[PDB]
């Protein structure tokens, strides 16, 4: 019923959207919000970054409280098997389709 752009505008407001085909398998997508993080937190606290990246941040920014790093918003899918797929991609099919709806 909706185009992919309308779904995108619904995602940016924090809603869960889906294509009609996905309903049988119960899949939906949602947006994880952008955030800005201080470099000291990235180096010393964040669990979910590989050590090499944290070392790079220390090499360049050097554990400053003032220095901040932007982490972009992105799309995630609640896939059929229940797991959360971070970094969801729109296929050509998905982009050009008009069977998008809002789950919640």
């Amino acid at each position: 019923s909706m185009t992919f752009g309308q779904a995108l505008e619904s995602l940016k407001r924090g809603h869960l959207v889906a294509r009609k085909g996905w309903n049988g398998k119960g899949m939906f997508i949602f947006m994880r919000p952008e955030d800005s993080l201080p470099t000291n937190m990235i180096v010393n606290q964040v669990k979910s970054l590989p050590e090499s990246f944290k070392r790079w941040v220390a090499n360049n920014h050097g554990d400053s409280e003032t220095d901040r790093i932007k982490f972009t918003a992105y799309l995630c899918m609640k896939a059929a098997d229940g797991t959360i797929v971070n970094g969801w991609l729109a296929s050509q099919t998905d982009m050009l389709a008009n069977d998008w709806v809002i789950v919640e």
Copy 2:
């Protein structure tokens, strides 16, 4: 400036679109339309398909019975260096951006 949804609606209409934010200059994206091709043509006439795929089509359809295979519409990018990138992908930043403009 438009949303990616509005850029997509332009693309479906035949328009060339780009993002001001894109680092490269002169880069734009366009949509190539959908076409249904007869199986005999796919196996014999088409030179842009690999031999394994053509063999598969021949095994399945036998170049007979007026069988036709749809090839879907897809986005493509005229990149900075003049090459045409078939099958352009929208990055999270692209999908969520609102600095899209029509180029033609």
Copy 3:
């Protein structure tokens, strides 16, 4: 069972590959090869390009000087419903999986 990297090398040599889960649906992916096209052919002959792009090519190459425009190689998918999806894109799951198989 192969990694996505091995799947890719097999794609570059013209093979049909798939993930094991895809088998029930019958899906597979393959590479369409790259090719350079003369701009007069693009402007005057190619059916699968939109008018605006043909005009851009005319205005920027002149349909003269034997200018050749490259069209990159790219992946496509034979999808569940039989149609050929141009411009297949790998999910995060696809890229990081090691359940890839050669189909042909």
Copy 4:
């Protein structure tokens, strides 16, 4: 000068990798690891998920511990302007390229 497949195996080991060909300067990609999270932490503690998804999880899992939800590994890009792009996806050019180098 490595394949995307070799870059991917380096990314699985936690390294930072990149392409010489990329237009912007100083960019690289890295993998954020897979994690499994108890549903009560997802509902009551995680700040970076929309409230609609927290609601969905609570309605389906009832705020129970030892009910866990997997969050997949995924690729991220340290972009040219210093922001981290969550959910980086490979373009046809990136996948089929052989100019990959280990940054760290």
